Amino acid sequence: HHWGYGKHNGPEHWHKDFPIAKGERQSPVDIDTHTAKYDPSLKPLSVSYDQATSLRILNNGHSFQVTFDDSQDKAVLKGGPLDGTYRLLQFHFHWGSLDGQGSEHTVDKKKYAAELHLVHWNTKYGDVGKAVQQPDGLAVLGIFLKVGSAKPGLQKVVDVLDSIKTEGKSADFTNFDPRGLLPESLDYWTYPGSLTTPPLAECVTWIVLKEPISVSSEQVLKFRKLNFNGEGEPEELMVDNWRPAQPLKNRQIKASFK
Ligand SMILES: O=C(CCCCCCC(=O)Nc1ccccc1)NO
Numbered sequence: 001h002h003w004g005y006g007k008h009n010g011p012e013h014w015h016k017d018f019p020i021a022k023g024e025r026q027s028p029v030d031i032d033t034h035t036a037k038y039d040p041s042l043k044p045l046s047v048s049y050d051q052a053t054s055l056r057i058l059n060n061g062h063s064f065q066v067t068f069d070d071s072q073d074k075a076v077l078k079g080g081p082l083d084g085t086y087r088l089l090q091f092h093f094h095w096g097s098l099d100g101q102g103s104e105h106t107v108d109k110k111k112y113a114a115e116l117h118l119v120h121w122n123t124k125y126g127d128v129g130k131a132v133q134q135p136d137g138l139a140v141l142g143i144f145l146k147v148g149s150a151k152p153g154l155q156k157v158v159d160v161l162d163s164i165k166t167e168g169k170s171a172d173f174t175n176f177d178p179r180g181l182l183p184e185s186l187d188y189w190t191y192p193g194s195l196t197t198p199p200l201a202e203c204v205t206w207i208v209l210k211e212p213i214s215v216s217s218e219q220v221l222k223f224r225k226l227n228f229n230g231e232g233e234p235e236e237l238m239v240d241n242w243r244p245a246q247p248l249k250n251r252q253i254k255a256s257f258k
């Protein structure tokens with residue numbers, strides 16, 4: 001029926017509605033660290049989040065997202081492999097039912113407990129809907145989460161999840177600073193790929209940071225209390241909302257570091 005992460009509607013079914021699922025630049029991928037090539041040409045990345053304006057937090061039935069005002073150049077990503085300016089629209093997470101799975105990208109086949117995606121769109125296309133129709137329309141910053149010490153900058157998110165438990169719920173989420181989600185190092189791998197949910201459009205320059213952030217067990221347990229269902233339907237925990245690694249095909253993953 002409609003897509004999701006279950007046995008009957010999960011990633012192995014998506015190609016019937018979205019044939020690009022078997023396309024030439026699908027995401028996520030396994031990052032083989034010994035095959036990625038250091039690219040001395042890659043320009044230094046620029047994450048400019050000081051004027052970011054968060055708006056709302058939303059359970060969309062597949063993840064939860066924090067949305068930003070992207071009607072002006074307030075929070076932008078530039079540099080790295082990117083040409084031009086990419087505006088932050090929203091961030092969301094993918095996570096597991098257990099700490100050994102949950103990420104979408106893997107590193108030498110290792111799965112992390114979760115993966116944060118900070119979604120940005122190329123301002124030369126004017127709006128996100130036009131950007132998703134372009135091969136360089138989006139830039140997604142991917143950040144792995146491992147379980148250990150708490151991430152203080154994540155706590156304001158986790159504390160409001162009770163208020164968006166089920167699909168369709170949203171809440172006001174102003175003055176949230178996404179800089180509190182970033183690791184120390186901006187070393188990264190990059191490759192051309194796609195959205196990891198339907199419609200799987202092949203419009204993303206992926207920038208995946210090498211350094212994970214640590215979150216606590218209590219923080220990730222609160223992610224796993226969300227529901228895929230809407231208020232009143234059989235309760236199905238929102239866990240394992242990740243797509244597995246797809247074939248690399250004719251792509252090379254580049255590293256910003258030696
Ligand atoms: O695919 C991903 C990462 C990138 C997600 C892109 C979502 C962009 C968004 O919020 N707006 C949008 C999406 C599709 C079509 C039009 C707008 N994770 O699953």
Ligand SMILES: [Zn+2]
Pocket residue numbers: 092093094117196
């Ligand atoms: Zn995502």
